[PDB]
Every structure is written in C-alpha cells, then in structure tokens.
Design an enzyme around this catalytic site. Structure first.
Site, PDB file in Angstrom:
ATOM      1  N   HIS A  79     -10.461   5.626   4.028  1.00 46.70           N
ATOM      2  CA  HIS A  79      -9.548   4.549   3.613  1.00 46.70           C
ATOM      3  C   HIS A  79      -9.781   3.261   4.412  1.00 46.70           C
ATOM      4  O   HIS A  79     -10.228   3.276   5.544  1.00 46.70           O
ATOM      5  CB  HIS A  79      -8.054   4.845   3.787  1.00 46.70           C
ATOM      6  CG  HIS A  79      -7.700   6.258   3.570  1.00 46.70           C
ATOM      7  ND1 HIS A  79      -7.391   7.076   4.606  1.00 46.70           N
ATOM      8  CD2 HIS A  79      -7.640   6.999   2.452  1.00 46.70           C
ATOM      9  CE1 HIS A  79      -7.145   8.281   4.139  1.00 46.70           C
ATOM     10  NE2 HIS A  79      -7.288   8.275   2.822  1.00 46.70           N
ATOM     11  N   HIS A  92      -2.776   2.853  -3.083  1.00 46.15           N
ATOM     12  CA  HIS A  92      -2.891   1.743  -2.163  1.00 46.15           C
ATOM     13  C   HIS A  92      -4.227   1.031  -2.416  1.00 46.15           C
ATOM     14  O   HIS A  92      -5.228   1.694  -2.786  1.00 46.15           O
ATOM     15  CB  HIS A  92      -2.893   2.256  -0.726  1.00 46.15           C
ATOM     16  CG  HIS A  92      -1.693   3.030  -0.355  1.00 46.15           C
ATOM     17  ND1 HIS A  92      -1.742   4.092   0.539  1.00 46.15           N
ATOM     18  CD2 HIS A  92      -0.392   2.841  -0.700  1.00 46.15           C
ATOM     19  CE1 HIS A  92      -0.493   4.495   0.740  1.00 46.15           C
ATOM     20  NE2 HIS A  92       0.334   3.753   0.007  1.00 46.15           N
ATOM     21  N   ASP A 140      -7.160   2.884  -0.722  1.00 46.66           N
ATOM     22  CA  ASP A 140      -7.373   4.306  -1.001  1.00 46.66           C
ATOM     23  C   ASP A 140      -8.725   4.554  -1.655  1.00 46.66           C
ATOM     24  O   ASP A 140      -8.875   4.516  -2.879  1.00 46.66           O
ATOM     25  CB  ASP A 140      -6.263   4.832  -1.903  1.00 46.66           C
ATOM     26  CG  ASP A 140      -4.947   4.962  -1.182  1.00 46.66           C
ATOM     27  OD1 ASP A 140      -4.956   4.873   0.110  1.00 46.66           O
ATOM     28  OD2 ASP A 140      -3.911   5.140  -1.850  1.00 46.66           O
ATOM     29  N   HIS A 150     -11.481  10.381   8.202  1.00 44.67           N
ATOM     30  CA  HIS A 150     -10.497  11.316   8.730  1.00 44.67           C
ATOM     31  C   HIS A 150     -11.029  12.729   8.937  1.00 44.67           C
ATOM     32  O   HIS A 150     -12.040  13.147   8.387  1.00 44.67           O
ATOM     33  CB  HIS A 150      -9.291  11.401   7.773  1.00 44.67           C
ATOM     34  CG  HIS A 150      -8.455  10.178   7.795  1.00 44.67           C
ATOM     35  ND1 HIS A 150      -7.354  10.045   8.597  1.00 44.67           N
ATOM     36  CD2 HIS A 150      -8.544   8.984   7.145  1.00 44.67           C
ATOM     37  CE1 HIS A 150      -6.805   8.862   8.407  1.00 44.67           C
ATOM     38  NE2 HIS A 150      -7.510   8.183   7.540  1.00 44.67           N
ATOM     39  N   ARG A 180      -7.907  10.575  12.869  1.00 43.29           N
ATOM     40  CA  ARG A 180      -8.879   9.540  12.610  1.00 43.29           C
ATOM     41  C   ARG A 180     -10.135   9.808  13.449  1.00 43.29           C
ATOM     42  O   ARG A 180     -10.086   9.660  14.676  1.00 43.29           O
ATOM     43  CB  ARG A 180      -8.293   8.174  12.918  1.00 43.29           C
ATOM     44  CG  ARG A 180      -6.994   7.926  12.125  1.00 43.29           C
ATOM     45  CD  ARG A 180      -6.317   6.599  12.438  1.00 43.29           C
ATOM     46  NE  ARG A 180      -5.076   6.551  11.665  1.00 43.29           N
ATOM     47  CZ  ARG A 180      -4.341   5.470  11.490  1.00 43.29           C
ATOM     48  NH1 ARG A 180      -4.695   4.276  11.956  1.00 43.29           N
ATOM     49  NH2 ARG A 180      -3.237   5.577  10.781  1.00 43.29           N
TER      50      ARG A 180
HETATM   51 CU   LIG Z   1      -7.141   6.473   6.475  1.00 50.43          CU
HETATM   52 ZN   LIG Z   2      -3.222   5.387   0.904  1.00 48.36          ZN
END
Ligand SMILES: [Cu+2]
Ligand SMILES: [Zn+2]
Ligand SMILES: [Cl-]
Ligand SMILES: [Cl-]
Ligand SMILES: [Cu+2]
Ligand SMILES: [Zn+2]
Lengths: 153, 153
Positions: free
Chosen positions: A46, A80, A83, A120, A143
């Site tokens: 992301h 988002h 995303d 991630h 992360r």
């Molecule tokens: Cu992220």
């Molecule tokens: Zn998101």
C-alpha cells in the site's frame, strides 16, 4: 511520461526497488520492480499517507485515503487510493511486482509522490476478513519495509 | 502540503532529520533540524532534482533547477531553486539547521516534495569561485548524506 521510484528498506532483510510510470495525464500508472527477503506467498502492498520515515515504517501513518473510503482491494470500487492489494513472493523470497492502477496518480489530489510505499508481513484480506480491521488495514500486519516515493528522471 | 520531512543518511554515520513548514503557498518555507556526524564548519546543502536513491545520493542527479538558471547562494536572484547555501557544524560535528527560504515551496511548480535533500563534503562557494563548476555545483564536493523529501502530518 511522468516517473517515480521508491527504494524499500526496513529493520530486517527486506529490500527492493519499485518503479512507477504514468504516460498520460490521469492515465494508468504502471508499477513494477522487485522485492527480496520476504516469505513465500502474498504480502500487503500500500501507499501510506505520510512520507515520514523518522521512526521507520510506523511513521508513515495510515493508508492514503483522501476520499474517506473503506479499505479494499485494487479491483474494487470501494478502496483507499493507496490500496494496491498484494504482491506475491516465490520460494526464494523474491516478489516480482507488476501492477497497473488508475486510482493512484503521479499528479493532482491522488498524487502518491512524497508518500510512503509499504510492504507488509501478512497478506491483505482486501476488506473481506469479517472483522472491523479488515475494512481499515486489511489485516496485513507489520511493516517489513518502506520508502518514500520520489520523482524519477 | 504545509509540512514535509526528510531523513538524511550516509556513511559515517551521517544522520539527520530536517523539517519543512509552509504556512501558505505564497509564503516562505521554514527549514529546521539537526545533522550529526560531519566535520566542523560549512557544508553545502541543496535540493537535487530526483527523489531517486537507488544507487545512493548520486542517483538524485543535479541541483533542482526548473528555470535553468546558474548556481548561486540562497540570497541571490540568480540561483537554482534548490540552492539552500551552507549549514554549519560545530566542533562535535553537529549542525543545527535553521533556514527560511522564499524560492523553494511545498506546492506548485517549485515544489520540493519527492525530491532529494543533500548535505555535502565541502562548503558551497555560492557561485563565486573562480571556476566553471562554481556556477553549477558550487564546488561542494561529494554527497555525504541524503534522503527523499516526504509529506508530513
Ligand atoms: Cu500498508
Ligand atoms: Zn487501505
Ligand atoms: Cl487482488
Ligand atoms: Cl549564504
Ligand atoms: Cu547538493
Ligand atoms: Zn545549485
């Protein structure tokens, strides 16, 4: 074309280089490169709001979400701006990234330049996980590496 | 937007956190923070064109110079947008950075978001050295540390 680049680094072995190219104003953004040092399988991917690495990846804050939507996958209308779904690593721990996306941009209000790209620990559940975090973070967990998205030549 | 941040890193270790704040788009940018691990005295300090750290600080390219002007000091009309002069380190190797600049911006065409901040080996001669490189690089020499300028909260 407008171009951007991001060098991913973190506290462990995960590192990579990701390129972005947007040939036309408001056109698709091509995202491609490679990430090494991750476990085999899917990993959430992301753009986070802040280009702030002062305390490592946590400083980048939440997903980039200028339109106040729920978290989703990149193929969803409800998502988002940041995303980008999952990237997939092979048995060697290497993910070849190849995405085309038309919600992110390299200009305007959906511009990602100066924000942070994050890979991630876990897979992103794309908002399908049936618990409240799913439609915020996708349950992608920690992360592992990040970098600020910079203007490229 | 109104705030940005940059984590400077290089061999030494050279380490710093530089903050940027701009109250309104028609106002100056305040630039402040600290850099450690450098030699006592003046060090050149510039925004370079590309936010590309793929091969370290060299990948950032030349000074950010959208108007195609000559290199100068920050006070000069004839300067690059990225020309922030020198910062000064003390005997302990720490520079406290405190600049106000009217030519850089955090938005618009002189926007420095997504570009690279660099601190140099040598002092910047502000374009008043005797040689042709003076009005290109200021003879500031090698790039000690850099980072990409990111949007901050
Ligand atoms: Cu992220
Ligand atoms: Zn998101
Ligand atoms: Cl997907
Ligand atoms: Cl000066
Ligand atoms: Cu420089
Ligand atoms: Zn210059």
């Amino acid at each position: 074309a407008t171009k951007a680049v991001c060098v991913l680094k973190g506290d462990g072995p995960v590192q990579g280089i990701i390129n972005f190219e947007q040939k036309e104003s408001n056109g698709p953004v091509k995202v491609w490169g490679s990430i090494k040092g991750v476990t085999e399988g899917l990993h959430g991917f992301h753009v986070h709001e802040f280009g702030d690495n002062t305390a490592g990846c946590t400083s980048a804050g939440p997903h980039f979400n200028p339109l106040s939507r729920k978290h989703g996958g990149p193929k969803d209308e409800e998502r988002h701006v940041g995303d980008l779904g999952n990237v997939t690593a092979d048995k060697d721990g290497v993910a070849d990234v190849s995405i085309e996306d038309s919600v992110i941009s390299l200009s305007g209000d959906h511009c990602i330049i100066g924000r942070t790209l994050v890979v991630h620990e876990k897979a992103d559940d794309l908002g399908k996980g049936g618990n409240e975090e799913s439609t915020k973070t996708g349950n992608a967990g920690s992360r592992l590496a990040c970098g600020v998205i910079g203007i490229a030549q």
